[PDB]
Every structure is written in structure tokens, then in C-alpha cells.
Design a binder for this molecule. Structure first.
Ligand SMILES: [Mg+2]
Ligand SMILES: [Mg+2]
Ligand SMILES: [Mg+2]
Ligand SMILES: [Mg+2]
Ligand SMILES: [Zn+2]
Ligand SMILES: [Zn+2]
Lengths: 153, 153
């Protein structure tokens, strides 16, 4: 059957694979993801260790098919969370391509949101792929007013 | 004349005033901003002190008319900055209502972006108000795929 478990330190490679696959499928350049590979792994390692990167893995008979990441990031108190100097952040949601008609992505999102609730977090954000956006909207997520610009990059 | 200067620790109250005015004018609830007031001030104080919140003030004959804030936040290496575990963040841009036809907002944005360039930052983000958005777009800023959801808030 299908079971969910918390991420652990031994999931380092899994998370890196999920991140790359998610971005590749969303149309990011393979060479850019190759440049990101080692920097991301080096970033993730200590944060799995100290729990600042947490999340959940969905497994079929013990084999990981999907994963999600979550963080609680420092943020200035804000009208969406006037009393809190933090917000939730969801990242690296990836579901195996042959297992996308089973509610896995929604199940992992539910686990992530529930974890934020348990932690008393007022407000959360994520950066969607075009593929994920309809699910997030269905689940009560709204587009923000964020904008971006390359500076030296 | 009009002169720009770096923010200093004595600008604590100025920055808090700018933040409130910016959000009020953007249509955020006055009561919510009132709830944010003390938490935000307490958050800002040590960060002005240590430079993690930096920025610039525009003055007319020594009287502050406008300000902008900038931070370099921790972030996982990402396809928009594959080699860097950080991104630039711009916040609290406010211009006195009687001085909005003078290019001040664009001038402060230019100073902020140049500061990020000096610091070798690859990529930056901001959260726009509807009022600011046309300027940012003119200045080469693009909407992101960020979405948000209240959790316990
Ligand atoms: Mg283990
Ligand atoms: Mg954002
Ligand atoms: Mg001073
Ligand atoms: Mg964002
Ligand atoms: Zn299966
Ligand atoms: Zn004047």
C-alpha cells in the first residue's frame, strides 16, 4: 500500500532528485539545473540535519514515489501575519509521473499545511509551477504580488 | 535640493511610518497594521543595528520625504541563481504623496538594485503594491509564480 513518512537525513539524494525533476519538467534549462546541483546539495545537507528543512515522503511498499519540503522562514511582521516574524514555505513537491492520478500531491500538500498548523504558523507561501497551480488554487492558495529581477545573474 | 543618504539606526521610526503608510494606502486594514506595529518595530531594531536591514532615504533640505529597504535573505540555490544560496529583497518603498512626480521611487529603486549589484547578488524579489507595479514592470521586474495561503491566521 501507500504510506507517508517524515523526511530524514538519508533522504538527501531523494530531495535533490525531486528538485531537479520538478524544475526540468517545468522547463528550466538542464545546464542551469546542473550548475545548481552541488550548491543545492551542500545547502540542504546541514538543514536536513538540523530540521530547518523538513517534509514528507510518499512510499509504495517502502519505495519513495513522491516528496514535499517545508521550511519556516524568518520574515518581518506583515499584515498577513501581524504578530509573527515568520512564514511557512513549501518547496520541492514532486510526484512520480506514473502515479499522478491518485491524489498524492494533494495528500502531501495537506500534510505540509497541517504541519504548519501544528506549529502555529499564520501564513505560508510557495512558488508554483504551471502544472501545480490548478491544484493549489483548488486548495485555497492565491497568487501574490511578488515580482523578480535578475541583478548580476 | 534633493539628496539621498544611507539609512541609519536613528531611522527606526521613519521606517515604521513608511511601512504603515505604504500598506494603508494599498488598502490593508488599519487595525491589522496596528497589530503589526510593535512586532515590526521590535523585529527591525536589531536588524538596523547589524545592517541586515539596509536602505536609502531621500531628503529635501535635510527632511526625509521617501525611503526604501533592502535585505539579502537566505534562500536555496535555485535556477534563477544556481550558484548562490541567497536572494535580494526590496521592501518598504514609500514616497511622500506630495512628491510623487519627481522620479523619487525610480531613483530609490535604482539605488537598491545598484547596491545588490555591488554585493554580487544574482537575483532579487519584491512584493508589489498595485500602485508600484507599473514602475517595476517598466524597470524590468516580472511577476513570479508565488502563491499564498493563511494557515492559522
Ligand atoms: Mg533515515
Ligand atoms: Mg515572496
Ligand atoms: Mg544616524
Ligand atoms: Mg516568494
Ligand atoms: Zn504504483
Ligand atoms: Zn518639496
Amino acid at each position: 500500500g501507500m504510506e507517508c513518512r517524515p523526511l530524514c537525513i538519508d533522504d538527501l539524494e531523494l530531495v535533490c532528485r525531486h528538485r531537479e525533476a520538478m524544475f526540468r519538467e517545468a522547463g528550466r534549462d538542464a545546464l542551469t539545473l546542473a550548475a545548481m546541483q552541488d550548491p543545492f546539495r551542500d545547502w540542504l545537507l546541514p538543514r536536513l540535519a538540523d530540521g530547518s528543512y523538513f517534509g514528507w515522503v510518499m512510499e509504495e511498499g517502502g519505495a519513495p514515489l513522491a516528496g514535499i519540503g517545508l521550511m519556516v522562514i524568518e520574515w518581518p511582521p506583515h499584515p498577513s501575519h501581524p504578530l509573527q516574524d515568520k512564514r511557512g514555505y513549501i518547496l520541492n513537491l514532486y510526484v512520480d509521473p506514473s502515479h499522478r492520478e491518485r491524489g498524492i500531491g494533494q495528500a502531501l500538500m495537506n500534510r505540509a499545511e497541517a504541519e504548519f498548523a501544528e506549529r502555529g504558523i499564520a501564513f505560508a507561501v510557495l512558488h508554483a509551477t504551471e502544472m501545480g497551480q490548478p491544484l493549489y488554487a483548488r486548495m485555497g492558495w492565491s497568487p501574490t504580488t511578488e515580482m523578480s529581477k535578475p541583478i548580476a545573474g
